[PDB]
């Protein structure tokens, strides 16, 4: 029974490595990156990198962030979406320039596709308590387009003028209205551009808020 | 055009299937025969005593 003792010692060694690389893994921030294609996901992952399934790593103020891009999965989303149930936050990218743009694969604004995808993800049974970081890209391009193409082409019920800072706010609340779990999750909207303005910092602030609120909810204080 | 393979698939299935369609009574009979032949060798069907149970010795 000496080799048995050696086997038990090896097993205990293995539990020890498991504990170390598990407690190390608990300190990383998992971010699921969603959004329709050509909407800025590549650009977004570009600034977060410079600081199948594609996984990206980046550090910011110590916090270690893992970002999983699942845009290459053409399979049924419902079958693997129960994975990522434990991600700390979801990053959603929407191109504001898509408002007057229909979609390949017509009469469908690439904009209403973003809406339907956001509606499905936000109100999913697996993400009832997971906050969403909503990124609205292409600020300058959209604000240029808004000066000759009215937002009414996308929203027949819109009444405001054709100025970006009002239209962008209108789109912001329209995407937040799709949230039907206002009492358990929160949406951190942020406007970005081609240039990295504050994207990584905004993600860091949102994630820090999410961690603090998760701690508060666990103690029953929030 | 590409769907052209589904007719050949289904006709192969037809011949492959109706070459033998033994009665479901026969399938049921051989199923019960197989189940009752290997009974008493299935440790789950009848609980194995702890003397030769490797998970409690």
């Amino acid at each position: 029974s000496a080799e048995d003792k050696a086997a038990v010692e090896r097993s205990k060694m293995i539990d020890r490595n498991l504990r170390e690389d598990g407690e190390k893994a608990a300190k990383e921030v998992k971010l699921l990156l969603l959004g329709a294609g050509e909407s800025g996901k590549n650009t977004i992952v570009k600034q977060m990198k410079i600081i199948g399934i594609v996984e990206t790593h980046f550090t910011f103020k110590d916090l270690y962030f893992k970002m999983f891009d699942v845009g290459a999965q053409r399979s049924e989303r419902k079958k693997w979406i129960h994975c990522f149930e434990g991600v700390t936050a979801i990053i959603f990218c929407v191109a504001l320039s898509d408002y007057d743009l229909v979609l390949a694969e017509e009469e469908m604004n690439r904009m209403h596709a973003s809406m339907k995808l956001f509606d499905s993800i936000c109100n999913n049974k697996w993400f009832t308590e997971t906050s969403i970081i909503l990124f609205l890209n292409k600020k300058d391009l959209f604000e240029e387009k808004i000066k000759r193409s009215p937002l009414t082409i996308c929203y027949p019920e819109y009444t405001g003028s054709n100025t970006y800072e009002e239209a962008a706010a209108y789109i912001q609340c329209q995407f937040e209205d799709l949230n039907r779990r206002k009492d358990t999750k929160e949406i951190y909207t942020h406007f970005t551009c081609s240039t990295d303005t504050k994207n990584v910092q905004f993600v860091f602030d949102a994630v820090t808020d999410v961690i603090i609120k998760n701690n508060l909810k666990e103690c029953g204080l929030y | 055009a590409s769907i052209a393979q589904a007719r050949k698939l289904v006709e192969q299935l037809k011949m492959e299937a109706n070459i033998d369609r033994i009665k479901v009574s026969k399938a049921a009979a051989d199923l019960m025969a197989y189940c009752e032949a290997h009974a008493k060798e299935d440790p789950l069907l009848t609980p194995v005593p702890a003397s030769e149970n490797p998970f409690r010795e």
């Binding site: 820090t208 808020d209 701690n215 666990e218 | -």
Partner: protein, 317 residues
């Protein structure tokens, strides 16, 4: 020495002894009772607020159950301050009992007031400083109640050994004593009806030393959560004010009780005032910001401001 002879000579005259009678100005008793009853009404108002608002987010971010426990503790302190004016006749057996009871209620009340505050501060520190995306901070009210119960248990074990090993013997001592210097000699005689126990300073030092360790840890916690959140939830200023007031009141009241047994009105007034001031100040510091922020929190929860810390690692000169 003729002391032994005069011993038995005074024993014949020692058959009787002076009794006791109430000599507390009624006005004083009246004003004090009014102040204490008003403080108890304030306590009832604060508990009513708490309960009614237990679902308000901010009230929910302020640990209502621990606020309740602190309120019970404050009620205990108020009732003990009510008891410090019960210097009336009663009977010897009860006077011992009365003093022991009021001191043990005051000690228990202090524990029940300060335990929950320290628990809230420790939980807030853990929540706002440990930021692990997969290991959450899970502290419930049951655990903090358990810590408060441990504090309470320790306090009652100390009080139990105090009463069961060395009670407050109220005794009549008639004594005459002559004191001599290197070149001078004089004589004096005195009578003293004091309700003190043998080795009283042992118990005072022990009880107030455990309380002092608790207060030191409380000050440490208040420093730890310096700018963790806003005053409604931060509560570090409450701890600092409370510990300073507790130290000042404890020292002053101890000194006055020991050296002014001949001034019953002054001792009673100072004791009641100190207890009332400390308890009311702590309770107000606990509850006033909740009342202030309660009205601004129904409209819509966007004005969340508590989230705000202080962590950086710049180099040092």
């Amino acid at each position: 020495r003729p002391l032994h002879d005069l011993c038995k000579t005074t024993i014949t005259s020692s058959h009787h002894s002076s009794k006791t009678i109430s000599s507390l100005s009624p006005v004083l008793l009246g004003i004090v009772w009014t102040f204490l009853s008003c403080g108890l009404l304030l306590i009832l108002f604060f508990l009513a607020f708490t309960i009614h608002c237990r679902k308000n987010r901010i009230v929910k971010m302020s640990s209502p159950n621990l606020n309740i426990v602190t309120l019970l503790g404050s009620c205990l302190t108020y009732s003990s301050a009510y008891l410090f004016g019960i210097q009336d006749v009663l009977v010897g057996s009860s006077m011992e009992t009365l003093i022991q009871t009021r001191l043990s209620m005051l000690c228990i009340g202090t524990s029940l007031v300060f335990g929950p505050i320290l628990g809230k501060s420790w939980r807030l520190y853990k929540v706002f400083t440990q930021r692990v995306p997969d290991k959450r901070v899970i502290i419930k009210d049951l655990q903090l109640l358990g810590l408060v119960a441990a504090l309470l248990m320790a306090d009652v074990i100390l009080l139990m050994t105090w009463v069961l090993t060395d009670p407050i013997q109220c005794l009549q001592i008639l004594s005459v004593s002559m004191t001599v210097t290197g070149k001078d000699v004089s004589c004096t005689s005195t009578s003293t009806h004091f309700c003190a126990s043998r080795y009283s300073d042992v118990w005072i030092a022990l009880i107030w030393g455990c309380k002092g360790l608790l207060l030191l840890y409380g000050a440490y916690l208040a420093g730890l959560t310096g700018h963790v959140s806003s005053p409604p939830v931060n509560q570090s200023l409450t701890i600092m004010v409370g510990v300073n007031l507790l130290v000042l009141a404890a020292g002053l009241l101890f000194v006055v009780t020991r050296y002014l047994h001949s001034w019953p009105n002054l001792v009673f007034g100072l004791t009641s005032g100190g207890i009332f001031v400390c308890t009311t100040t702590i309770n107000c510091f606990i509850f006033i910001p909740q009342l202030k922020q309660w009205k601004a929190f129904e409209e819509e929860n966007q004005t969340i401001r508590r989230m705000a810390k202080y962590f950086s690692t710049p180099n040092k000169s």
